[PDB]
RNA sequence: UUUCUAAUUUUUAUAUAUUGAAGUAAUAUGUAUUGAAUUGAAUAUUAAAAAUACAAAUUUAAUUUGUAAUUAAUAAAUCU
């Protein structure tokens, strides 16, 4: 989606862990939330995982075992 | 229809518009879950969960963008 854009999202992935390699359990999913500016600019904001993927956790279950009743 | 006359029924009757409301804004459970190669409100089914209002669409292979944001617009007042 950078190159899309032309951007080489080959730096970003570096920008993105500079700040997320530490600090993590192993495995954490993330959510990423990119805003591209009118000036190609990006800023992103790193966020906790999905609360779905909390929920799977606390309660040891795999895609497709869980649904609506 | 005796004849002159008089008379109250007439090849004259009313027909649906004012307004291509199109500016006003980054986000945040959430790309729910399931079925799915993939689907993020806009495949398929499923529809009464929430909170800090905007899930019956267009759009994209998916999203983001981008259109859209529940409003003044009184023909009725017979025309004879």
């Given at each position: 989606?950078?190159?899309?854009?032309?951007?080489?999202?080959?730096?970003?992935?570096?920008?993105?862990?500079?700040?997320?390699?530490?600090?993590?359990?192993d495995?954490?999913?993330?959510?990423?939330?990119?805003?591209?500016?009118?000036?190609?600019?990006?800023?992103?904001?790193?966020?906790?995982?999905?609360?779905?993927?909390?929920?799977?956790?606390?309660?040891?279950?795999?895609?497709?075992?869980?649904?609506?009743?």
């Amino acid at each position: 989606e950078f190159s899309k854009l032309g951007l080489k999202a080959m730096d970003f992935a570096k920008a993105f862990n500079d700040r997320t390699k530490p600090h993590f359990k192993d495995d954490i999913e993330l959510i990423v939330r990119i805003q591209v500016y009118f000036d190609k600019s990006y800023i992103f904001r790193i966020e906790p995982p999905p609360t779905a993927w909390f929920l799977l956790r606390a309660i040891r279950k795999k895609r497709g075992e869980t649904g609506p009743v």
